[PDB]
Structure formats: structure tokens, C-alpha cells
Design a protein around this nucleic acid. Sequence first.
DNA 1: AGGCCGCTCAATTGGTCGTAGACAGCTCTAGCACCGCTTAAACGCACGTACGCGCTGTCCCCCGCGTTTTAACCTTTTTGG
Length: 158
Amino acid sequence: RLYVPGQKSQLFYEQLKDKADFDTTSEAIVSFEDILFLTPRGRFEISMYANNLRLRGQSYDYKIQNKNVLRIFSLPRLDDRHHLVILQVDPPLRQGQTRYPFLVMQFDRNEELEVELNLSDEEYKSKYEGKLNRSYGTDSTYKILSHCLRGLTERRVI
DNA sequence: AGGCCGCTCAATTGGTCGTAGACAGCTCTAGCACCGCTTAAACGCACGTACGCGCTGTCCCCCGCGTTTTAACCTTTTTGG
């Protein structure tokens, strides 16, 4: 871990990415924008891939491997206005010195989202048939997210 | 001693008066009620350190438990032929 002061670390990261020749033209299977987390609290974009989950935030990007997701909880809040989706991750996520073994996402129950998966028809049939839907209709965001997480991590939703 | 009459003073009976307060009716203030707009305050959160607390150490003055100090009682024997 490097600390690069000044307004400079983002340009250094871009230049390191170009020179290290990291895998390019990455095709997220599905993205979810503006998800309000509670632990830690932040508006993260969730991009899902075949082997890994990415959390993009204003100050912190996290890459979680699908194997490191131990458990998925889908729990209604007692306010009857919100729904919690909770990920247990091992090893626990780090933000400086603090660790987050649980990621707590908070959805509105009335929030509906329509999402098409970015998959070829051959790859869908061979790998994801009966695990994921090709298109999700206008259903509650937390249900679509919980099903996508179940299909990609092969973990049971509690 | 024991029981009964007289009395005295304080609670209660009897009767008398004046007003305090109940009742009604009226006014109108202010208390509730809502609505819109502003923004400082609250809040959620992150981060770090200082302070509260558990642990170690030292001292007091009680004590258990022991080794040691010193005294008194018992025992044994007093040449050979």
C-alpha cells in the first residue's frame, strides 16, 4: 500500500493500469448504481463478474472474489419501509484500520429496477441456465440483487 | 371499700341570621391549529488517543507454623582372686 498525497493518486493508478497491462475490455454481467450501504455507509456501485464482485465508491474501490462470500442474508427492516441485504465476507473488507466482516446494504421496498444481463446466448445456456434469469422484469431491486448474488456466488440466501 | 349524687366543662342540641359561594350568562383573550419558508442544528461516520481499568508490585501488621533453646528426669555402673 502506497500513500500518494496531493490533488494525483488517481492518475498514478491509471498510469500503473496502462503499464502493468491488466485484463482489459472487462464485461460486467450486471451493474447496480447508487446502492446506499450502512456498514460502511456509502453510495457504492456494485458491478458483478463471473469470478468477482466489485464495489466502486467515491473514495474506495473494493474487489471481492465470489469464493470469499460466505453467506447472503435478505432481511426486512421492522420499519416496514426498507429491506436489508447483508453479505458475510472472509477475509473481512478493510478501510484503513477498521474491518467489515459484514456488508450491510439498505434498499427501499418500493424501489423497482429492470435489468438485462450482459451475456451471450451460448454462455447463458451453458453456465447460467436455471441459476440466473436472462432479463429481470420491473421487480424490487433487493430481490433482483439477491437472485444475482445467489446465481454468481452459489451461496444460499438466508 | 364500694356505690351514688353533685358539678363542671366540653361536645352536642336547639334555634336564629347574614353572607359566601353556587349558578347562570356574557365577553373576548389566548391557546390550539395549520402552513410555508429558512437554515442552523442534529446526525451519521470516520479516526485517533487518552483515560479508565485490569494486572503487578510494595508495604503493613496481623498470624501460622516451625526450629531452636535450655532444663530437668532417668538410667547404669563402680578391680581381681
